[PDB]
């Protein structure tokens, strides 16, 4: 199959910068009747992709003229003169010459700002779960800046894998930050059994975790 | 204006088949190809395969040979994809897209498909209560379908509120949703999660209280 390699993976930007994403395909994608058929779309989440540009170069009706499309063969290039918020989101590009059709692996445009290290904050089951015969221990790593992030458990000095729940949201619409949920589930007699519970977040903004903890 | 509308969101049961709609309008339903997209949640866009109802013919990607049926109602401007035996590997959004040869497409909304056994069933809400600032929180266990409604003390307390998306285990779906209020708020004045879940008809309060 015709291999779609999207670069950047992800494009940080500030309103009004100029923004160019690229898109290299593994073999040729010029069409035996001529034509190239590749495609830019934007995705915001929850919505279907909208499509920018047909035929490499050419604006789909209604697309704010900021947007461009370029390049030949193997080679084509997305630029978008002055970002503005509804710009933020998704994009993938689409090669239709050659069966099976694929799609790049997509570039998130999401806004740039200052780093900011997680807001962490640990939570052991409520009474009323544990009187439920359950328990979940709840971590939240909250406010931070960029996105990547990893979270990790630890039982009495111990790491734990199993029972793991992650979530992300997305960038937040006020202050530009991302924030990710994670849940450690246990049956009632197991968490009884331990003390104390751990959660560190690894993050770009320090060297070392953020650790927080409680005992029984 | 072309038009594609898709069929409403499926529940489905594991092991189970599906079958989707997209009913087409404003051209001549023969002449145009349709194709469908897979898309999992937080993932990309896989293509299907492409099928023409003015011929019957069709493509499927060799991945979703096994996965995947085309066929259509010219008598309805219809084409359905149905889905085979069906794992949690398939729940995901699948779009229908239409084109003339050589000319743009047209995309559908998407149709949601989610594969679980569960009856409906309401939430169970805990409160989390820590062990300048102050973080509290609540967690959403053990509901289905989708979606709930989490809210902060009726809705006044909005700024701070971070509610994550669920996640399904074992069937039945979990999320948290954390706030954070300045510590002269709380505890001195009250914290309350909302949560409704429109499939149950139900609305619970739960009070967040010191440990
Ligand atoms: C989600 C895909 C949306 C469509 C992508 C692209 O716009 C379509 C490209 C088409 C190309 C690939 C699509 C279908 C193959 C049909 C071959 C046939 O006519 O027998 C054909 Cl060759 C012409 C061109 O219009």
């Known amino acids: 199959d015709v291999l779609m390699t999207q670069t950047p993976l992800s494009l940080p930007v500030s309103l009004g910068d100029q923004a160019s994403i690229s898109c290299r395909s593994s073999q040729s994608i010029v069409h035996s009747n001529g034509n190239t058929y590749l495609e830019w779309y934007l995705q915001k989440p929850g919505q279907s992709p909208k499509l920018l540009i047909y035929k490499v170069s050419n604006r789909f009706s209604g697309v704010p003229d900021r947007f461009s499309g370029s390049g030949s063969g193997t080679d084509f290039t997305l630029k978008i003169n002055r970002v503005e918020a509804e710009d933020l989101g998704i994009y993938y590009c689409?090669?239709?010459?050659?069966?099976?059709?694929?799609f790049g692996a997509g570039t998130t445009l999401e806004l740039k700002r200052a780093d900011a290290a997680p807001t962490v904050s640990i939570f052991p089951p409520s009474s009323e779960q544990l009187t439920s015969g359950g328990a979940s221990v709840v971590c939240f790593l909250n406010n931070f800046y960029p996105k990547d992030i990893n979270v990790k458990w630890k039982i009495d000095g111990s790491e734990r894998q199993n029972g793991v729940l992650n979530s992300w949201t997305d960038q937040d619409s006020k202050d530009s930050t991302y924030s990710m949920s994670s849940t450690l589930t246990l049956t009632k007699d197991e968490y009884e059994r331990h003390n104390s519970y751990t959660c560190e977040a690894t993050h770009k903004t320090s060297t070392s975790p953020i650790v927080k903890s409680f005992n029984r | 204006k072309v038009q594609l509308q898709q069929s409403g969101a499926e529940l489905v049961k594991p092991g189970a088949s599906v079958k989707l709609s997209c009913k087409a309008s404003g051209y001549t339903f023969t002449e145009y190809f349709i194709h469908w997209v897979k898309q999992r949640s937080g993932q990309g866009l896989e293509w299907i395969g492409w099928?023409?109802?003015?011929?019957?013919?069709?493509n499927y990607n060799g991945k979703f040979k096994d996965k995947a049926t085309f066929t259509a109602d010219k008598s309805s401007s219809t084409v359905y994809l149905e889905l085979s035996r069906l794992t949690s590997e398939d729940s995901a959004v699948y779009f229908c897209?239409?084109?003339?040869?050589?000319?743009?497409?047209?995309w559908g909304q998407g149709t949601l498909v989610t594969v679980s056994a569960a009856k409906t069933t309401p939430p169970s809400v805990y409160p989390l209560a820590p062990g300048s600032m102050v973080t509290l929180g609540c967690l959403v266990k053990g509901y289905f379908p989708e979606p709930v409604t989490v809210t902060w003390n009726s809705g006044s307390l909005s700024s701070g509120v971070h509610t994550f998306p669920a996640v399904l285990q074992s069937d039945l779906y979990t999320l948290s949703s954390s706030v954070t209020v300045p510590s002269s708020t709380w505890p001195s004045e009250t914290v309350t999660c909302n949560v409704a879940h429109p499939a149950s008809s139900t609305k619970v309060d739960k009070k967040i209280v010191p440990r």
């Open positions: 099928f023409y109802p003015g011929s019957g013919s069709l």
């Open positions: 689409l090669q239709g010459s050659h069966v099976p059709l694929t």
């Open positions: 897209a239409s084109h003339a040869y050589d000319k743009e497409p047209y």
